[PDB]
Symmetry: C3
Subunit: 223 residues, 3 copies
């Protein structure tokens, strides 16, 4: 695997919508096929079938599976066996052990809980790890909070603290660093500012949830 | 103990002023009877006697004892034996061991030194721990600094870093998270902003030093 | 050694320019003779000779050597043997072991990489350590970034996170804390603000790269 060779534009795409796969792969540098919150709890088995019969370039495609310890992740690995994918994205990554149990595939840990932020280095250190990502939304939620950004749009302090935390963790161990998804899709000004900053700080990628986000991300990382 | 069931409004009240106990308990969700810097070094033995003959609901009352390794903390535990209190707040909490030696009572660790911030997770992990709190004032002081806030009123960076640090530590281990006391009592605008933010970020409590602070705190955590 | 007794004004001075040594020592509280990036890769052997025949007060002088594991650091220690200097500054300090191998001399660790920030406490804990310093420029560079400050001049978040990280690390272990060099020499307003803040937060020193920077630093730490 050499996802570092790919551009900075990564895009999420629900695994239950195989019709969009082709467009997504063509629009992004890397496509993250989602089996998690991007697919209804009743559409998962469908998304798993589509993940099989509708193949995508394993060179530029990662599969986001479900959280460690769940039944859905178990079903995800079973469905992943019938594909040529080697890299998985683990949500709510909270320990090296959750990463290790995914060996021998490559794992991008998505830190989005307090325990994960606290064990960020341990997670980035694990052998299977090839990338570190963070998410503000589940972070604030699992914290018992209700807002990741303040009035002025800027992320709250805890989220900023974590962003810097996973950047250092990922870097300290030669892992790829992925910046958080800009949830307000129509807010391209905001995305541009975060992406520019992410480029300037060392992040290698900024994940997008909408194809319209890719060109702004690719431009912010231009130079 | 179930202090989580109590409201977000916690209030400090010097143990040498038993006359105010009743008013305090009635005004706050939880009352922190203080045996530390809230009582003159010569009024401590008095505060200890008042802690005995003037009982308060052990369900909504915690006792802040003195720092680990001191003679005063020793005298505090002895005086605490003659009461129905189970939860203590430990100032200058700098290690799991300082928490552990307070077993079998429940402990809320108050991180307010560099060593404590550095060992925040170790402290939150300890078995006796049921809550994590932070304080900017002793933090800057023990750091050799002289100001916790900058011109614009906002906390300096080191303090903000620590605030986020104890929030993640406390949360990662299912502990209660208490935000720092707003020292400028008449500045309700400032308190409102910090409390709102604390509510939004996951803090479960914002400690107050004055009864007039409680209603603003309770409102900020409204929704 | 008692560098804490010295003023807050520390100044870098290339070891290949022995003519300036005298002026530098007279202008600063402590002089950091540089054998690293402050001297051309071809002028190093010259700087090493000048470090020998042109002595400076070992009480107020530290020598910045080259990174652990390099040939240049090896040549630096050999040249350092013929001098009365006891304290060295280690760039790209990334572990306790890199510090330990410099025993028995005193070491000021300069954290300026992700691994170093991640192991900040381990480094500050090492026996040889007497000081902790940080640098934004190599930090962003080694991170794969390209800018340590944002449009408004303020340091980017990752750099601010690290600054606070080495302050707590150094303090938690009774080490001296040195704030980052203000690269824009003619920007005295900016330096004044950072130095004032550093004074207020607990930093004991603010390193300068130009003699004109010392008086502003000394004034910011006045009170
Ligand atoms: O589902 C999404 O689109 C994004 C998501 O879960 C996350 O960032 O954690
Ligand atoms: O004494 C007080 O009122 C508050 C205090 O010590 C602290 O926050 O650490
Ligand atoms: O060379 C200089 O002048 C400053 C430097 O390397 C650093 O701060 O790391
Ligand atoms: Mg998520
Ligand atoms: Mg205190
Ligand atoms: Mg450098």
């Amino acid at each position: 695997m050499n996802l570092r060779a790919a551009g900075p534009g990564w895009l999420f795409c629900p695994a239950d919508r195989p019709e969009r796969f082709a467009k997504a792969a063509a629009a992004a540098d890397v496509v993250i096929l989602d089996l998690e919150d991007g697919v209804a709890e009743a559409q998962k088995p469908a998304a798993r079938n589509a993940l099989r019969d509708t193949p995508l370039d394993p060179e530029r495609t990662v599969v986001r599976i479900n959280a460690g310890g769940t039944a859905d992740q178990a079903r995800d690995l079973e469905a992943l066996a019938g594909t040529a994918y080697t890299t998985v994205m683990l949500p709510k990554a909270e320990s090296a052990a959750q990463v290790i149990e995914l060996a021998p595939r490559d794992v991008i840990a998505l830190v989005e809980t307090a325990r994960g932020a606290v064990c960020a280095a341990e997670i980035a250190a694990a052998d299977p790890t090839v990338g570190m990502m963070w998410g503000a939304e589940d972070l604030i939620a699992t914290l018992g909070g209700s807002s990741s950004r303040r009035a002025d749009g800027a992320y709250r302090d805890v989220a900023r603290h974590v962003r810097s935390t996973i950047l250092l963790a990922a870097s300290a161990f030669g892992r790829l660093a992925l910046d958080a998804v800009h949830l307000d899709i129509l807010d391209v000004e905001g995305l541009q500012e975060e992406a520019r900053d992410a480029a300037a700080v060392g992040f290698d990628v900024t994940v997008c949830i909408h194809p319209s986000q890719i060109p702004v991300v690719r431009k912010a990382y231009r130079p």
